[PDB]
Enzyme design. Sequence first.
Site, short mmCIF file in Angstrom:
data_model
loop_
_atom_site.label_atom_id
_atom_site.label_comp_id
_atom_site.label_asym_id
_atom_site.label_seq_id
_atom_site.Cartn_x
_atom_site.Cartn_y
_atom_site.Cartn_z
N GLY A 7 0.79 -1.24 0.00
CA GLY A 7 0.00 0.00 0.00
C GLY A 7 0.82 1.29 0.00
N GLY A 10 -0.61 4.48 -1.33
CA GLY A 10 -1.75 4.98 -0.60
C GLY A 10 -1.41 6.17 0.29
N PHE A 11 -2.44 6.76 0.87
CA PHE A 11 -2.28 7.97 1.65
C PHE A 11 -1.40 7.75 2.90
CE2 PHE A 11 -4.08 10.56 5.14
CZ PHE A 11 -3.63 11.80 4.71
N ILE A 12 -1.69 6.71 3.68
CA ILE A 12 -0.84 6.37 4.83
C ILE A 12 0.49 5.76 4.40
CG2 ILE A 12 -0.56 4.93 6.88
CD1 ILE A 12 -2.47 7.25 7.27
N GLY A 13 0.44 4.87 3.41
CA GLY A 13 1.61 4.17 2.92
C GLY A 13 2.74 5.06 2.50
N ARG A 32 1.01 -3.20 -7.62
CA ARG A 32 -0.13 -3.87 -8.28
C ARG A 32 0.07 -4.06 -9.78
NH1 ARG A 32 -5.85 -4.52 -7.55
NH2 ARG A 32 -5.55 -3.80 -5.39
N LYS A 119 -11.25 -5.44 10.76
CA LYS A 119 -9.96 -5.24 11.37
C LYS A 119 -9.76 -6.20 12.57
CE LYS A 119 -8.84 -0.51 9.57
NZ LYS A 119 -8.21 0.73 10.04
N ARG A 123 -6.90 -9.24 13.18
CA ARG A 123 -6.13 -9.28 14.41
C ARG A 123 -6.17 -10.66 15.02
NH1 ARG A 123 -6.71 -4.23 18.62
NH2 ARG A 123 -6.08 -2.57 17.23
N1 LIG Z 1 -6.49 8.01 11.36
C1 LIG Z 1 -6.66 8.56 10.16
O1 LIG Z 1 -6.82 9.94 10.06
C2 LIG Z 1 -6.69 7.69 8.92
C3 LIG Z 1 -6.90 8.29 7.66
C4 LIG Z 1 -6.73 7.52 6.50
C5 LIG Z 1 -6.74 6.12 6.62
N2 LIG Z 1 -6.62 5.50 7.86
C6 LIG Z 1 -6.43 4.03 7.93
O2 LIG Z 1 -5.20 3.77 7.28
C7 LIG Z 1 -5.24 2.53 6.58
C8 LIG Z 1 -4.77 2.84 5.15
O3 LIG Z 1 -5.80 3.48 4.41
P1 LIG Z 1 -5.55 4.54 3.19
O4 LIG Z 1 -6.70 5.49 3.23
O5 LIG Z 1 -4.18 5.11 3.20
O6 LIG Z 1 -5.68 3.62 1.89
P2 LIG Z 1 -5.54 4.12 0.35
O7 LIG Z 1 -5.19 5.57 0.38
O8 LIG Z 1 -6.81 3.70 -0.27
O9 LIG Z 1 -4.33 3.22 -0.16
C9 LIG Z 1 -4.46 1.83 -0.07
C10 LIG Z 1 -3.21 1.26 -0.70
O10 LIG Z 1 -3.26 -0.15 -0.64
C11 LIG Z 1 -3.06 -0.72 -1.92
N3 LIG Z 1 -3.78 -2.00 -1.99
C12 LIG Z 1 -5.13 -2.21 -1.79
N4 LIG Z 1 -5.43 -3.51 -2.08
C13 LIG Z 1 -4.26 -4.14 -2.37
C14 LIG Z 1 -3.95 -5.49 -2.54
N5 LIG Z 1 -4.90 -6.43 -2.40
N6 LIG Z 1 -2.68 -5.81 -3.00
C15 LIG Z 1 -1.65 -4.91 -2.83
N7 LIG Z 1 -1.94 -3.58 -2.52
C16 LIG Z 1 -3.23 -3.20 -2.36
C17 LIG Z 1 -3.50 0.38 -2.88
O11 LIG Z 1 -2.87 0.33 -4.12
P3 LIG Z 1 -3.71 0.39 -5.50
O12 LIG Z 1 -3.92 1.88 -5.65
O13 LIG Z 1 -2.87 -0.24 -6.57
O14 LIG Z 1 -5.02 -0.38 -5.42
C18 LIG Z 1 -3.13 1.66 -2.17
O15 LIG Z 1 -1.81 2.05 -2.48
C19 LIG Z 1 -6.66 2.00 6.65
O16 LIG Z 1 -6.80 0.88 7.48
C20 LIG Z 1 -7.47 3.15 7.23
O17 LIG Z 1 -8.56 2.70 8.03
C21 LIG Z 1 -6.63 6.28 9.00
O1 LIG Z 2 -9.86 3.87 12.89
C1 LIG Z 2 -9.92 4.82 11.91
C2 LIG Z 2 -9.92 6.18 12.27
C3 LIG Z 2 -10.01 7.19 11.31
O2 LIG Z 2 -10.00 8.50 11.70
C4 LIG Z 2 -10.11 6.80 9.85
C5 LIG Z 2 -10.09 5.34 9.54
C6 LIG Z 2 -10.00 4.41 10.57
O3 LIG Z 2 -10.21 4.95 8.23
C7 LIG Z 2 -10.96 5.80 7.34
C8 LIG Z 2 -11.07 5.11 6.01
C9 LIG Z 2 -12.27 4.49 5.64
C10 LIG Z 2 -12.41 3.82 4.42
C11 LIG Z 2 -11.33 3.76 3.54
O4 LIG Z 2 -11.40 3.11 2.36
C12 LIG Z 2 -10.05 4.39 3.94
O5 LIG Z 2 -8.99 4.35 3.11
C13 LIG Z 2 -9.97 5.05 5.16
C14 LIG Z 2 -10.25 7.17 7.33
O6 LIG Z 2 -10.84 8.07 6.38
C15 LIG Z 2 -10.23 7.82 8.73
#
Ligand SMILES: NC(=O)c1ccc[n+]([C@@H]2O[C@H](COP(=O)([O-])OP(=O)(O)OC[C@H]3O[C@@H](n4cnc5c(N)ncnc54)[C@H](OP(=O)(O)O)[C@@H]3O)[C@@H](O)[C@H]2O)c1
Ligand SMILES: Oc1cc(O)c2c(c1)O[C@H](c1ccc(O)c(O)c1)[C@@H](O)C2
Length: 296
Positions: A7, A10-13, A32, A119, A123
């Site tokens: 990932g 992705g945004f976190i990645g 991918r 999730k 775990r």
């Molecule tokens: N606390 C917060 O403020 C916050 C905010 C954002 C997210 N999060 C959490 O952070 C985690 C990451 O989310 P995100 O929003 O960063 O995700 P994202 O932006 O959607 O990026 C997901 C990444 O995973 C890859 N991926 C998905 N399916 C795949 C697979 N089967 N094989 C290999 N790679 C794959 C995608 O690549 P492709 O583009 O090629 O599909 C993409 O690079 C999540 O669990 C979310 O709940 C928390």
């Molecule tokens: O536990 C959390 C806490 C958050 O603040 C967030 C989480 C998970 O995940 C959310 C989320 C939901 C669906 C998604 O596909 C994604 O990439 C991220 C994100 O927008 C914000």
Amino acid sequence: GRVLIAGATGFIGQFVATASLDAHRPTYILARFKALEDKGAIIVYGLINEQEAMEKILKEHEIDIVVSTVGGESILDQIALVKAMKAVGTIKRFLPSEFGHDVNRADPVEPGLNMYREKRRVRQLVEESGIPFTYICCNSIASWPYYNNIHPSEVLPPTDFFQIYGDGNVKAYFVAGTDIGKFTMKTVDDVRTLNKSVHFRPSCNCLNINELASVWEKKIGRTLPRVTVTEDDLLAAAGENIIPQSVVAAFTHDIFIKGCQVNFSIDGPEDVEVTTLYPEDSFRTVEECFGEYIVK
Ligand SMILES: NC(=O)c1ccc[n+]([C@@H]2O[C@H](COP(=O)([O-])OP(=O)(O)OC[C@H]3O[C@@H](n4cnc5c(N)ncnc54)[C@H](OP(=O)(O)O)[C@@H]3O)[C@@H](O)[C@H]2O)c1
Ligand SMILES: Oc1cc(O)c2c(c1)O[C@H](c1ccc(O)c(O)c1)[C@@H](O)C2
């Protein structure tokens, strides 16, 4: 200690992959990119839902640490990855795609609840499988928390009026992306994070929505109107079941109405906190992150 990150685009990645390279760790990134490759990353090709292909990769590249940052719609794709790590038997640490709240304590409404079901399902597979693990519960990324936006920090905070959730007096913790990345990567081979949940509670970044508004006002040198968005407004957005907008609405409720980031103690032995693990190692403040936008 070779690291494989799923990932990374992705945004976190992006933050986690950048941090790993900055710490001079051998870093393989599953595909991918350019910026990461120019900084030393080794790109390897596959999907995490293909067990036999992940086994091949972990074996061939002698991977020690696996960090998954797949999105909310791909949480269950990690089931194949776990089975693959169990089979190769050599993984020193797995960080699954967590990066938010403590999924075992929080109780958001649907459709947020179902991402947390997923999730929790990962775990429990991780632990029954005997993979050593660290769960990163890093709370909210430092942004304006828009109620229906999955990547809110990609948008500028408001310049017309503030929509203030509830009383606007429930604390959350905000962490810069760069800090999520940096401190995530410190934990992967820390003896003190083995089979732990790592909580991000930077005390200077513990702010309510009203305080956040005032930090932005002071940046823009100008006040805005403040209006109330109620609990019912948010639960009605959640009740619509539009993915992923309604999910983020569920979480906003949990955070700013119910107080989920701050309503539990981390004093037990399965919980550790980043600032006490890594003392005298300051977090970026929200003032400083909001400064970043003010360069538009
Ligand atoms: N606390 C917060 O403020 C916050 C905010 C954002 C997210 N999060 C959490 O952070 C985690 C990451 O989310 P995100 O929003 O960063 O995700 P994202 O932006 O959607 O990026 C997901 C990444 O995973 C890859 N991926 C998905 N399916 C795949 C697979 N089967 N094989 C290999 N790679 C794959 C995608 O690549 P492709 O583009 O090629 O599909 C993409 O690079 C999540 O669990 C979310 O709940 C928390
Ligand atoms: O536990 C959390 C806490 C958050 O603040 C967030 C989480 C998970 O995940 C959310 C989320 C939901 C669906 C998604 O596909 C994604 O990439 C991220 C994100 O927008 C914000």
